Amino acid sequence: PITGKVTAVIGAIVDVHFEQSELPAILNALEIKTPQGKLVLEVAQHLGENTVRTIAMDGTEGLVRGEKVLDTGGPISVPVGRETLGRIINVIGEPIDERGPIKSKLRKPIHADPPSFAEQSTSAEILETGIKVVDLLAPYARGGKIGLFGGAGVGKTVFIQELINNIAKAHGGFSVFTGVGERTREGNDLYREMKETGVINLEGESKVALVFGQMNEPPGARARVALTGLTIAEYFRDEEGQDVLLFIDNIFRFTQAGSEVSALLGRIPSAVGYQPTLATDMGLLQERITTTKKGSVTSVQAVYVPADDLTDPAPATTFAHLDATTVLSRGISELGIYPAVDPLDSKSRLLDAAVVGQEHYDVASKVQETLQTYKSLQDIIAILGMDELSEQDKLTVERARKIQRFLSQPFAVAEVFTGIPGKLVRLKDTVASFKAVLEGKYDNIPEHAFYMVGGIEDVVAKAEKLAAE
Amino acid sequence: PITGKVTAVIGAIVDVHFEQSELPAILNALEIKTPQGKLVLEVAQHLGENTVRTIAMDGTEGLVRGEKVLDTGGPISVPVGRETLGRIINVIGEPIDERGPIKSKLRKPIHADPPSFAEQSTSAEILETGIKVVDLLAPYARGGKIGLFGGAGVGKTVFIQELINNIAKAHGGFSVFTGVGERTREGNDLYREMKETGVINLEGESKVALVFGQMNEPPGARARVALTGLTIAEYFRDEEGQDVLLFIDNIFRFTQAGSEVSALLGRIPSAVGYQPTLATDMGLLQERITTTKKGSVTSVQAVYVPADDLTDPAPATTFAHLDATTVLSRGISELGIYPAVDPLDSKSRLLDAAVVGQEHYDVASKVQETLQTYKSLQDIIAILGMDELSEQDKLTVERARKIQRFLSQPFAVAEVFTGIPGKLVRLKDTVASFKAVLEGKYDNIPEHAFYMVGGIEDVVAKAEKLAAE
Amino acid sequence: NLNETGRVLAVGDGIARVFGLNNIQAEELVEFSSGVKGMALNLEPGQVGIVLFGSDRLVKEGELVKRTGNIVDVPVGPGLLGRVVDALGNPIDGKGPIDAAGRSRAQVKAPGILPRRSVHEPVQTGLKAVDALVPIGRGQRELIIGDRQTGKTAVALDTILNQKRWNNGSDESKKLYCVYVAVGQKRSTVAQLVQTLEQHDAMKYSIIVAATASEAAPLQYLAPFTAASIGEWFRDNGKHALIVYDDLSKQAVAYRQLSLLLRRPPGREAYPGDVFYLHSRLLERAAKLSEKEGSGSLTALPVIETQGGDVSAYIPTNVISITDGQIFLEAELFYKGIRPAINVGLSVSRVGSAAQVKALKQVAGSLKLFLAQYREVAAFAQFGSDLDASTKQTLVRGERLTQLLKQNQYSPLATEEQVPLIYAGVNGHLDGIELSRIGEFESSFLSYLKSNHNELLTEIREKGELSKELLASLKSATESFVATF
Numbered sequence A, B: 001p002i003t004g005k006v007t008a009v010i011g012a013i014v015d016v017h018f019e020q021s022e023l024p025a026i027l028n029a030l031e032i033k034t035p036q037g038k039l040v041l042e043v044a045q046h047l048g049e050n051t052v053r054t055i056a057m058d059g060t061e062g063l064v065r066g067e068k069v070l071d072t073g074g075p076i077s078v079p080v081g082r083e084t085l086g087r088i089i090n091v092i093g094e095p096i097d098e099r100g101p102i103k104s105k106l107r108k109p110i111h112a113d114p115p116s117f118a119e120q121s122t123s124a125e126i127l128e129t130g131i132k133v134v135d136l137l138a139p140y141a142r143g144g145k146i147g148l149f150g151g152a153g154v155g156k157t158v159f160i161q162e163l164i165n166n167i168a169k170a171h172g173g174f175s176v177f178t179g180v181g182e183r184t185r186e187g188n189d190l191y192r193e194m195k196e197t198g199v200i201n202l203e204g205e206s207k208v209a210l211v212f213g214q215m216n217e218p219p220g221a222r223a224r225v226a227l228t229g230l231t232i233a234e235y236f237r238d239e240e241g242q243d244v245l246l247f248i249d250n251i252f253r254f255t256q257a258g259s260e261v262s263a264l265l266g267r268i269p270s271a272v273g274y275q276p277t278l279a280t281d282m283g284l285l286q287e288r289i290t291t292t293k294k295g296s297v298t299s300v301q302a303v304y305v306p307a308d309d310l311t312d313p314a315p316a317t318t319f320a321h322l323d324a325t326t327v328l329s330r331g332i333s334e335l336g337i338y339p340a341v342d343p344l345d346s347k348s349r350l351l352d353a354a355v356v357g358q359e360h361y362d363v364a365s366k367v368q369e370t371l372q373t374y375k376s377l378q379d380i381i382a383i384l385g386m387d388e389l390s391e392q393d394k395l396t397v398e399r400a401r402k403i404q405r406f407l408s409q410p411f412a413v414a415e416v417f418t419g420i421p422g423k424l425v426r427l428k429d430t431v432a433s434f435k436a437v438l439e440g441k442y443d444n445i446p447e448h449a450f451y452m453v454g455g456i457e458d459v460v461a462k463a464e465k466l467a468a469e
Numbered sequence C: 001n002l003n004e005t006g007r008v009l010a011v012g013d014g015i016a017r018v019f020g021l022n023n024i025q026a027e028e029l030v031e032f033s034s035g036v037k038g039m040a041l042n043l044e045p046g047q048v049g050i051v052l053f054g055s056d057r058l059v060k061e062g063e064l065v066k067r068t069g070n071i072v073d074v075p076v077g078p079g080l081l082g083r084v085v086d087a088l089g090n091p092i093d094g095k096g097p098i099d100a101a102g103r104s105r106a107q108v109k110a111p112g113i114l115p116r117r118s119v120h121e122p123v124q125t126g127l128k129a130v131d132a133l134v135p136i137g138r139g140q141r142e143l144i145i146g147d148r149q150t151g152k153t154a155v156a157l158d159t160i161l162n163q164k165r166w167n168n169g170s171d172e173s174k175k176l177y178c179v180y181v182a183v184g185q186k187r188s189t190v191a192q193l194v195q196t197l198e199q200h201d202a203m204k205y206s207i208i209v210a211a212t213a214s215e216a217a218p219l220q221y222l223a224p225f226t227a228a229s230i231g232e233w234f235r236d237n238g239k240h241a242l243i244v245y246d247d248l249s250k251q252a253v254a255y256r257q258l259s260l261l262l263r264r265p266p267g268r269e270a271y272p273g274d275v276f277y278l279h280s281r282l283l284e285r286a287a288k289l290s291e292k293e294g295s296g297s298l299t300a301l302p303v304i305e306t307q308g309g310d311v312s313a314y315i316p317t318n319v320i321s322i323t324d325g326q327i328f329l330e331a332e333l334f335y336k337g338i339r340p341a342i343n344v345g346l347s348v349s350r351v352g353s354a355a356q357v358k359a360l361k362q363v364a365g366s367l368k369l370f371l372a373q374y375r376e377v378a379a380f381a382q383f384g385s386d387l388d389a390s391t392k393q394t395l396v397r398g399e400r401l402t403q404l405l406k407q408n409q410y411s412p413l414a415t416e417e418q419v420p421l422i423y424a425g426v427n428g429h430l431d432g433i434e435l436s437r438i439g440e441f442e443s444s445f446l447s448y449l450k451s452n453h454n455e456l457l458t459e460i461r462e463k464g465e466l467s468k469e470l471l472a473s474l475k476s477a478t479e480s481f482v483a484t485f
């Protein structure tokens, strides 16, 4: 078999030489039988003198000049199948949950070409999510890229949990989770909560697969984990014939690792320090996330904005691909409404009459008008008071507060900590429920009746039960 | 002797090839007997192939490829001890005063390792400087380290001269003045005044040692004279056990001289253009300027801030090495408030009630609070005016304008170009005055009464004089 | 013998290039003639790049350089407690030799997903602004970030000093040992810090690791990993540790020096490409381990120094992304007498309520809500008179609370002393008290509570939770004070 010898070790970069004159292809995986486990290297350059330069998928410490390296005959091959569910998989397709091997029948390369133009879906389509604020103002797209902007402190993990629950359980399907540079503590917490919520079961059926690339791992791994999970999502699409959704957390670190690997490979740094291949790398990741005749891989991507600068090349390049945004802002939990999604900074491409219908577009537009009118008058409400307002704008502020509160929702997973029972609402029951508030029918009712109620048919009942107390 | 031949000359850098294997060590001193007078080179690195690369302590003009070089057997050696008192020494230890040779028993290397952690000693004593802003808001420590940070044109040379007049004679011990890239005129103006005031008795006992590298000297000299001054000061600290005060003006020039030579030494430049070794090349010098169980060194350092950018790597790194730091700023100079100290950016380790007293601490805290309240309202005053401000804030602004103006103080060495005669103000008087101002006793005296006067009694005297006008 | 023993080709600036050493492992130590040690960071087709732990004067071309076979390791054990040690565990305090339970490598791999347990127990700082607004848990990573001379070391050191009330205890589950890594600091600052810790008797539970400015850049780069390995002993033996790095910006500067002199290509701000991988594999070695692995914990408090308040700089941008939260210190708050100068709006915790003492949680919720309202209205703070009633009330309460959060240096508080004060602030009692008297308040109130209402403090401490029977008596006991005050 094709065997080579190491010639250089500089950080995460390793050079190998193949005297036998049969060099390995780019993106192929090579193996070194280290004392601890095995060290995988991905070929990144051919440099002549039969020398190839490779990015390490694990720590390079302990390497010796003159160590053997064995070619695997192809790219990093992840396991695929229903046997991946409940397991935690690393970048190289190996179980890290200590619960034994994966007995899968097949293994699939992490590098595959996107679907052709002839295969793409011809029309947009709506993902009924069960969260009022999402499917009223910023609805999600089947087979699209959805970008979540917010930290753990604002409910990010529980939002991902409720998505996994509503889409996969009420509607039906599987799910894939991919930690690209995730904090290990958050990953343990997610695993524990998913065991608590019944998405993972050890002794029975389970319906989410976990790919974790920890922040301690070298840049070559963080740059490739996303493909590791995307390939499993694509298998469930093209070989299980079902709609799946793929969580990438966080997409910023894909570009960060790309910048590390480019700098290490000696490529001239571009703007503030990103790789020239930034747009093309993001494309070769994202454009596999699309709808095809056999199904749709949907994606919900957490996007870390460094220094709150949406003009930084990383988020700027990410935005070109995603068409729905969901901003979880501290400025909304500071006043105590969860999910804590900003109804105004959050936006969607699919909020078009040709997609959601005119009845929905009108409601959404008048909501984004009432909330914005309120957000215009706050200086006036503070320096002056609410008496100075006109009787028109006083009603607008009343209905804006009622709407701000009614966008809140108790999650079916918050039943444990908040105690609140948790409910999900259909798009009709939400559009019509807000139409009734804007039409002023329920202006008789106090704001508190809107606070944690899944639909107006229950706001009436809460009002009655509060007045009876 | 070990001898070699010059093979390259690029600015201050000179390469020397030794025909046999016995190469000179790094930091050694090599001599060239050019008929214009000998030239000393310091070995910076071994290039290989029997070549060494060296920095020239004098102009490289006239050097010929093929010129002989001879090893002296060790580093640059400077004379140390009592016979260095009252004399002016060059980097290479030769006198630049015409009084002949420095006859001394010991010559000592300019390169030596800092004191261990066990040798350190931490003082807490306050050095009454006579300067109001310093003694109040940033008291200098005896046995400590003091920085006068300041851009061009803010007046830190007059500050150094005032500190010399005030401290150097009441110190009683020994003094060393190290000029590093400063004006030769202000070296002559120091020699002359020290000769008039008797601290330099050319034909008697003296108690100040002068070492003068100046902005006319090549970078190799600016980068190494500070070590000669340090060597003299360290001998006075350790070998004589006396109390020592070391003046260095300006220590930024050491790092700048290293930067000038780094590019020709063959190093990839770091940030805005400085050498990689900035933080450690600086430390090797700075950690020698310290008090030890064997003796005390009180260090006043001038630190140039280029382009008024306090964030330039050099000042940003120097701030960590000093116990007291007074930042002279240009704005306070345009306002006419000499000595131009920023009352807020200036800080000292000793401004704690355990040392200065609770009265003093609270007075300084109230001064800072008043001035920061004034600086937070500046936009309002610019656009809106002072009318909008509340009653407490109008008073705080009047009092801030009085305080910032009362921190002005005329210096006896500045009279030639300011006209106003000098004032020395005791610490107790300063605290009492600023206390009386904060407590509102002098709200009836105008701002002009506080400008360029000494104590509060002078404020009253000038108020009476202005009233009589 | 070139496999074991190479020859120096060139040397300078702290970097040597050695010929031979065909068998040397990456990051292995080499011993030069004249005994100077070095770390082999670059393995190249025909030469090895050694970074010298000492002065380069000793190394000369032609020097025989012999490999050690040892990846850099440092001693670990309890005998290090109360000692000042260099980046390699050698004692620099002069009290004598270290006694060590073993030796541990510097760059060991962090623990993975499975062995951890969630952060649920508090690292009590004794600072009101932290425990009540940005809680730190055991197993957490909290970045103390701020401009020069802003209060960071004070926060870390008050955290160290407040552990005295537990560490003298016999219950090993509460006592938290400390490690302080001085990177880039001058030796006199460490002398003063050890003086403070000795005065307060905190040294007996503190290890100081000092890669000072004069220390070679490799040792400044390496000291944090060795200090982490020292704390990891307490973690792996079921004990608890708090590792403070002061500061990681200077480790980054040292790594940049090393990289550039090794001729590696720079990235942003002249830093090397893989500085994120430098700090990441340092910080998240902090963990909270499950009962299976001994219940131990290691808590990291990395300091960062922001030039001009710019968090857009490379190393801040990286470390803010690695940590679980940030305490942001700002100078405009310092000069206003808000000390410690914690910007409650920029500061955040991602562990949150889980890390908080229950009694303090029960009030920090409202405290945070009200301070958010204040942060919103604050632009109109000065023209308080002409505003609306509700805005004026919010300004009043928020200003009184902000004043309430201040406290002196080296004067940490117990949570039994924090709860009553945050209660009296939240629940409106302090609104009648002039903004200048709040300092007289928290001093004169606790002294009252300790004297006349001791059982409230005893129960807040012992039980950990504010019961209603107790919250009502606390309301009573606060009314019975604001009346006399």
Ligand SMILES: Nc1ncnc2c1ncn2[C@@H]1O[C@H](COP(=O)(O)OP(=O)(O)OP(=O)(O)O)[C@@H](O)[C@H]1O
Pocket: B320, B348, B349, B351, B352, C147, C148, C149, C150, C151, C152, C153, C154, C155, C339, C340, C407, C408, C409
């Ligand atoms: N809570 C406080 N109350 C009063 N003074 C304080 C407080 N905290 C810090 N200080 C003062 O602030 C100064 C700086 O302390 P500290 O060592 O924490 O700063 P730093 O962040 O380490 O800055 P650097 O390390 O860059 O010097 C000290 O002189 C100290 O007296």
Ligand SMILES: [Mg+2]
Pocket: C152, C153, C246
């Ligand atoms: Mg500090």
